[PDB]
Design a protein around this ligand. Sequence first.
Ligand code: CLA
Ligand code: CLA
Ligand code: CLA
Ligand SMILES: CC(C)=CCC/C(C)=C/CC/C(C)=C/CC/C(C)=C/CC/C(C)=C/CC/C(C)=C/CC/C(C)=C/CC/C(C)=C/CC/C(C)=C/CC1=CC(=O)C(C)=C(C)C1=O
Ligand SMILES: CCCCCCCCCCCCCCCC(=O)OC[C@H](COP(=O)(O)OC[C@@H](O)CO)OC(=O)CCCCCCCCCCCCCCC
Ligand SMILES: CCCCCCCCCCCCCCCC(=O)OC[C@H](COP(=O)(O)OC[C@@H](O)CO)OC(=O)CCCCCCCCCCCCCCC
Ligand SMILES: CCCCCCCCCCCCCCCC(=O)OC[C@H](COP(=O)(O)OC[C@@H](O)CO)OC(=O)CCCCCCCCCCCCCCC
Ligand code: HEC
Ligand code: OEX
Ligand SMILES: [Cl-]
Ligand SMILES: [Cl-]
Ligand SMILES: [Fe+2]
Lengths: 33, 33, 51, 176, 97, 153, 334, 36, 30, 46, 37, 244, 137
Amino acid sequence: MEVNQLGLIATALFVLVPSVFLIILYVQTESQQ
Amino acid sequence: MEVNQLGLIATALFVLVPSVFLIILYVQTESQQ
Amino acid sequence: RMPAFFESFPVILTDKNGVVKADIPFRRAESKYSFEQQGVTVSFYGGELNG
Amino acid sequence: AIFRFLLFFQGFHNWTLNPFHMMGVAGVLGGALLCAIHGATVENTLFQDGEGASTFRAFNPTQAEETYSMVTANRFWSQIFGIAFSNKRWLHFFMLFVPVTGLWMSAIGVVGLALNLRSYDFISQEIRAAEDPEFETFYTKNLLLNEGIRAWMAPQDQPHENFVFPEEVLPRGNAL
Amino acid sequence: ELVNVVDEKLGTAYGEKIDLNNTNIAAFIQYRGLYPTLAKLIVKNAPYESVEDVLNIPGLTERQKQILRENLEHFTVTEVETALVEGGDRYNNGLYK
Amino acid sequence: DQKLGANVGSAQGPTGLGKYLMRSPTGEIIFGGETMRFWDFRGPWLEPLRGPNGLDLNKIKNDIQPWQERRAAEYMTHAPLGSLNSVGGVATEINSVNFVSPRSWLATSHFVLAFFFLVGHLWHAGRARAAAAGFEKGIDRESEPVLSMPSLD
Amino acid sequence: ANLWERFCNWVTSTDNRLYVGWFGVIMIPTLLAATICFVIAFIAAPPVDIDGIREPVSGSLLYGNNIITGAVVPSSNAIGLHFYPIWEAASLDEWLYNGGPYQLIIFHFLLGASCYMGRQWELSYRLGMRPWICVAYSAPLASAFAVFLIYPIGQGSFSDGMPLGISGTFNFMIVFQAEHNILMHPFHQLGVAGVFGGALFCAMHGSLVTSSLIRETTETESANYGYKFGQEEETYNIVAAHGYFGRLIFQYASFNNSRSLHFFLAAWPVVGVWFTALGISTMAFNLNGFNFNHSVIDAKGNVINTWADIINRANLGMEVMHERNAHNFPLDLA
Amino acid sequence: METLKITVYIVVTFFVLLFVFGFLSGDPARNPKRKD
Amino acid sequence: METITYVFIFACIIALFFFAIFFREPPRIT
Amino acid sequence: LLFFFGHIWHGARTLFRDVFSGIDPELSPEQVEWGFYQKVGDVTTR
Amino acid sequence: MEPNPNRQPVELNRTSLYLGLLLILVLALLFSSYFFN
Amino acid sequence: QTLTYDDIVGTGLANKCPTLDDTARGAYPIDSSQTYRIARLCLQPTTFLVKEEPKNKRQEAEFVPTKLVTRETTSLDQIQGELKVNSDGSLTFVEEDGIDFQPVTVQMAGGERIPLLFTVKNLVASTQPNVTSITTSTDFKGEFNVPSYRTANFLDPKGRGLASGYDSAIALPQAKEEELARANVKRFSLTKGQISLNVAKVDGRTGEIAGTFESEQLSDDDMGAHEPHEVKIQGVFYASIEPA
Amino acid sequence: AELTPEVLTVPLNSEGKTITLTEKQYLEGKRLFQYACASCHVGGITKTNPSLDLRTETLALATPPRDNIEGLVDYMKNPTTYDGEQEIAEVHPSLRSADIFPKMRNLTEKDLVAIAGHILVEPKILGDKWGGGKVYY
Ligand code: CLA
Ligand code: CLA
Ligand code: CLA
Ligand SMILES: CC(C)=CCC/C(C)=C/CC/C(C)=C/CC/C(C)=C/CC/C(C)=C/CC/C(C)=C/CC/C(C)=C/CC/C(C)=C/CC/C(C)=C/CC1=CC(=O)C(C)=C(C)C1=O
Ligand SMILES: CCCCCCCCCCCCCCCC(=O)OC[C@H](COP(=O)(O)OC[C@@H](O)CO)OC(=O)CCCCCCCCCCCCCCC
Ligand SMILES: CCCCCCCCCCCCCCCC(=O)OC[C@H](COP(=O)(O)OC[C@@H](O)CO)OC(=O)CCCCCCCCCCCCCCC
Ligand SMILES: CCCCCCCCCCCCCCCC(=O)OC[C@H](COP(=O)(O)OC[C@@H](O)CO)OC(=O)CCCCCCCCCCCCCCC
Ligand code: HEC
Ligand code: OEX
Ligand SMILES: [Cl-]
Ligand SMILES: [Cl-]
Ligand SMILES: [Fe+2]
């Protein structure tokens, strides 16, 4: 099907950007104490 | 120009994926002691 | 003319007072206003197809 | 009249397909889920603080102890569903966040509907369906129903337009 | 070059008279005395080469021939269209009220 | 339609299936349209037309008695459809025929009762187990069973 | 101890991470079979003939569907209510054409979901709890039985059951409106009052507790750390919330008993969903909503239209357009 | 098709026997408190 | 690309279920 | 419309700053009891 | 379960972050023209 | 002495044509001083072959064995028609009425579904000159008409049709219409086919005959949307004769 | 608008005579129409055969004419096809077949005039709604 050409990178960054934002916060938290 | 369509997401992930790998390791190091 | 509310709109032609006299029918088994039985023609004025 | 408002948004806006109403649906039904499951969990993890079979009176507002066991309720849901709450303050806040966030999203949805900025169509679906007469999905079947709603209720729902639709232009299926 | 054959036929006499070779049998109720006895005998003995040939149908009483003769002005003949005769659509074309 | 001269046995429908008569998935000749789902129906007004391979086409052309035409038209115009305020017909029909099928009352009224009684089973069965075990009024604080169990993780 | 009793002790063991139990013995294989067949069919099932008119409908992702349009399409109308397992078809191609996966999924799912409710009593009996949590779950379970089993029974075909898809669900809602006028039925209206009030009472109870949390924290940390798991004391002042919500309306319009309050929180949405579940079940036998079409006329006989007649024009639009080729006769009786 | 049918029939009957004999193997006794 | 995109997102959600259930933060009584 | 929520949120943060981390931990069923204080929350009127 | 004694902490100082970010940003600027092609 | 409806339901025999014993190999005399008629003609297909459309084309096409996906709904039965004796001694069967059509959908390798309208409408089959008796060596050859798979009132998923429906792509209001002309304008197909009726068993006492048949016709064209496939159907058949 | 005496005068026969119903004859006629007819003829159509409606234009061109009081009273006694060629009193309710259609057993000659009038007066009030179908609901 003739989909949007940027829907792939729009979805890839919709997942990757906020995911690694939360990963960065969790890993630095476990590394404290 | 008629460039490749996957070249955009190829460069974007090529930058992003190893970038966040180093960022996670750094922020979890400064949160130590 | 099509209102802004409608994604799709049928083709109906009225006259000077609004009486329906031509349309593009859906069911044709009992159609009374199709473009052939009414002999609907189109003419242009101005622009490219002028005349 | 509200029921007419519901059908008007389906025929003209395809409001069901809008992703903001879908989030609002999850807030209302998700809110009704938490309201039922939290009340049933409390009433079935109570402590025996009286001797009557109708346990409503074994509770004093003055009391300092919790009326039901948070530990037992946690183990029940951890083994039944996989996860479970373990903190009352986060639980009751979650019961505020879910229905409020749902309604806010639906409000954003129809703000765009004031400008007819609908979530009506999928372009990729329509383009090949226009050239493939054997491509049928549940999504194309709903748009035929909207084309029926619009053509059959418009002359009576919008009398100011003076809509006159002859019998031969009304979209209809077979026999019906 | 592709043309809707039923829309094209609406531009002929089929779109203003009762085509004895294509019109569904429910159209014979527009006039007096043609339904359902004569309407059945007409479609059964289709097609017809000219309008008057409907009077040579066997079994027509002399008064039957007369009632037709009073409705010849409302008849016509066009070449048979396959999309209008197949599926038995002259007896039930899928339209009701 | 047959009275008007239509050969119902060879009549082709818009979908390709027979307009009046088609076949069941096991070969039995049945009625066309949406009523293809109801080909398991058996009725006295209908059986005289059915043969070894289903509905007999030549019985259809010759053996339909006037009492069968009246019974079919009577049962057609008395379908088990109707509004709650007793307006017969489909939901889109206008007020006139005041009728609802007694089958519709008896079926719905006994499903509502059948459902709530299953809820009555679930209610009165779960409590009888708890009452016989001793914890129908709640957990005993001095002997909470979960506290004496190992952790899940 | 012999082997059979060792196995019985493991099944009903209160130490498993996930409780099995005797209801779980049936739930696990039925839910897995329905889950595995659904994920495969949602991705690569070929088009199936929903209405039995040799007009197949695409439903899987690999055949041109997205998440919003994809669905597992019900079984053919020529099947009706006949049992259609895999061994009744001459091949899996005929099985896939006639909507085989739909029957397999809903049957294993309904049987599995029923055992999920019985599994809720079972663990509550092993832990010393009160058993009526499964009664609350019966309302969404009865909702699944209505649109998957009861309504096909009343109409005579599984082709009119609710599809297993997002867009397919919207199709089930619109056609059900045109044929039963569900919006004008007092059972769906009670069901709307159950979910609206349920969301209302959920936000109300959540806001009032969070607003009367006693202080155990500073502002540089979350307030959730003030309560810790297993503590004996209550983490919020129940009296401060009553006098707050009492003065917002009047004193007696507010619950001072927490047990009576949490009972109300469970009774409103459950009893409301019970009715709308029976609303679908009773309309399966065509006892439809209130028909007020042409109910008001003037002194001469002219019809004075109301909002009910405007609804009737929208229903007629859905009526004449749904299943545009499956009808050869003027009445749609099922 | 038939040897699939025999398989499912044997698999279904197996779990049904586990379900019936399971609740009969003294289940009212399996509980926190009063085991009689 | 669309089908692979959808199946990938769905697979991650199922993968998140396994971690959130069996590798959860252990409930603890004080 | 989104900034309407910010006005009432940050607006409630300034007027209810004292109870931001919770309500006084030794409040008593007397400041809240009806028909007790003539004025709701005014200890100067018993 | 008793904890595993083979566990060690990982580090990456500030200078190693700049060197790594420089490597992949230059490798991207070099190879991007061949990705679009 | 024979089966009833309750002994056949669900068993699949309702789709089967009557057979004859192996000892039914006599002959049926045909007299020119009488008129005859087939009281019942039954055709039961057993093998559907579809000719695939190749590429280099200069290796002629072949017929593919395929599998059925529309179950036991494929037989033609209860067909009547006049059996006329000609001047050369040959017999011509002219079809009239009966269940002479069944829509059949068939799948080939790869998953492509080939719908078709298996039919013998308006069949006129004749024998070779002079046939004194219908024997086990007799065979028929005739032509029939193959109308459109869908009739005029049929609507596509977008609502377009021939005798009803839209006449454009209403979902693309401002798109060019010439690339979609083959999908907007429906055309009613009318083709012809052939069939041979090889008789193998004759009961000269009852007038019942039986044998094999092989017909060829085109598949569904979807109202002119695509090109049809050539289909070959094989199966058994049964028929009976009486004095008029 | 009111149910004026002028909307109650319908053709008596084919000779041009007129009959003026009362308010009670109208209300009585529509009450008995829903009793013995509306199961097939709701709104002026025919569920058993949508091709024949109860409009005054349709009854006028029937054989014999049925757009009056006499012909309709004659139709409820001996109903015929649209051309009068066949007496269809065996499949249509009538006093002559009151043995198979029990609803026709109690109708008096006065009741036949009240219903025949209601079938003529109602299209003078609803117009295209009478005998129009779902298109005009
Ligand atoms: C699964 C079913 C389902 C569910 C759960 C929802 C859920 C929702 N829909 Mg949707 N809907 C659905 C299916 C569904 N929808 C379908 C199939 C359609 C057809 C297309 C629609 C069409 C539709 C429309 C057209 C609209 C919704 C809206 C809404 C929202 C309602 C918000 C609300 O509470 O307003 C209720 C109103 C309020 C909360 C306002 C406050 C009113 C005050 C507080 C009441 C005070 C009363 C006072 C005491 C006096 C009373 C006296 C009186 C009783 C006498 C909610 C998110 C609406 C929306 O998105 O809103 C943004 C909307 O406009 N729906
Ligand atoms: C303008 C605001 C407004 C108001 C007042 C209502 C009110 C109502 N709607 Mg509606 N609705 C609205 C907007 C509104 N709606 C919108 C925007 C949509 C989407 C487009 C809908 C869609 C909708 C649907 C689809 C349905 C309703 C229904 C209802 C009823 C039940 C609602 C309910 O229990 O909710 C839950 C709320 C509560 C549980 C809180 C209680 C609220 C009650 C009504 C207040 C009563 C106060 C009382 C009069 C004061 C007493 C004073 C003294 C005696 C003590 C009720 C009459 C249903 C219906 O028709 O029922 C017959 C129904 O099916 N609504
Ligand atoms: C639901 C509405 C709502 C609510 C609950 C609040 C709540 C709050 N606001 Mg906000 N506010 C609102 C809407 C609202 N606001 C709107 C729409 C505006 C204008 C953009 C403001 C502007 C505003 C300012 C500038 C300030 C607040 C402040 C406050 C706080 C103090 C209470 C106050 O002064 O009320 C405000 C009072 C009202 C909203 C009552 C309005 C009544 C009007 C005057 C009646 C109009 C009648 C009109 C003539 C009818 C005819 C017109 C017709 C033709 C259309 C509190 C957190 C203060 C704050 O946070 O300080 C810490 C502050 O400085 N508000
Ligand atoms: C210009 C002029 C003239 C000026 C003069 C004006 C003036 C000065 C006023 C004086 C005159 C005057 C008084 C006029 C009267 C006017 C008038 C009548 C106005 C009223 C208008 C009106 C109709 C308002 C609507 C009424 C209304 C609010 C009804 C709502 C009823 C309702 C739905 C009640 C249900 C309550 C309910 C059951 C709640 C429990 C559910 C719930 C989840 C609770 C959770 C919960 C509860 C707790 O309880 C506690 C504890 C906790 C923990 C907790 O979780
Ligand atoms: C008796 C009336 C039955 C009506 C339906 C019952 C709904 C009640 C339960 C809902 C499911 C809740 C999930 C479980 C929640 C649960 O755990 O419940 C627990 C709760 C308290 O249990 P107790 O142990 O205190 O009492 C139960 C027994 O021990 C009785 O002594 O039970 C009750 O309050 C039952 C009261 C029924 C008394 C009548 C209330 C019924 C509501 C009002 C009836 C009219 C409304 C009808 C109009 C629509
Ligand atoms: C036989 C049993 C079968 C059950 C299978 C299990 C299904 C798994 C469901 C949940 C796993 C993920 C939970 C993650 C998140 C998680 O682990 O939460 C854990 C959390 C427990 O929180 P605590 O109270 O421990 O938290 C206190 C601290 O968080 C303070 O900050 O639970 C909740 O918050 C409940 C509300 C979230 C409830 C989420 C519901 C999920 C529904 C599914 C939505 C997606 C469906 C998409 C389909 C494509
Ligand atoms: C940081 C603020 C973010 C606010 C965004 C929300 C806008 C939505 C409209 C307003 C409805 C608000 C109702 C909230 C209800 C409310 O009032 O909340 C109040 C709450 C703060 O309350 P407290 O500090 O009392 O919370 C105590 C906590 O321990 C919770 O128990 O706010 C938050 O939790 C902020 C985080 C919510 C943020 C939501 C998640 C946003 C995710 C966005 C995903 C982005 C995708 C990016 C793609 C690139
Ligand atoms: C059920 C079926 C009914 C019932 C209960 C009544 N009618 Fe009649 N009606 C019916 C049919 C199938 C037909 C047409 C059949 C044919 O003509 O071959 C009719 C026709 C009429 C007509 C003639 C209409 C016309 O000529 O255009 C009239 C005048 C008529 N019906 C009246 C009538 C009355 C007065 C009834 C009850 C009191 C009644 N019908 C009942 C079908 C059915
Ligand atoms: O299938 Mn599904 O939807 Ca219950 O009506 Mn009839 O059928 Mn069909 O049309 Mn309407
Ligand atoms: Cl549909
Ligand atoms: Cl039909
Ligand atoms: Fe709570």
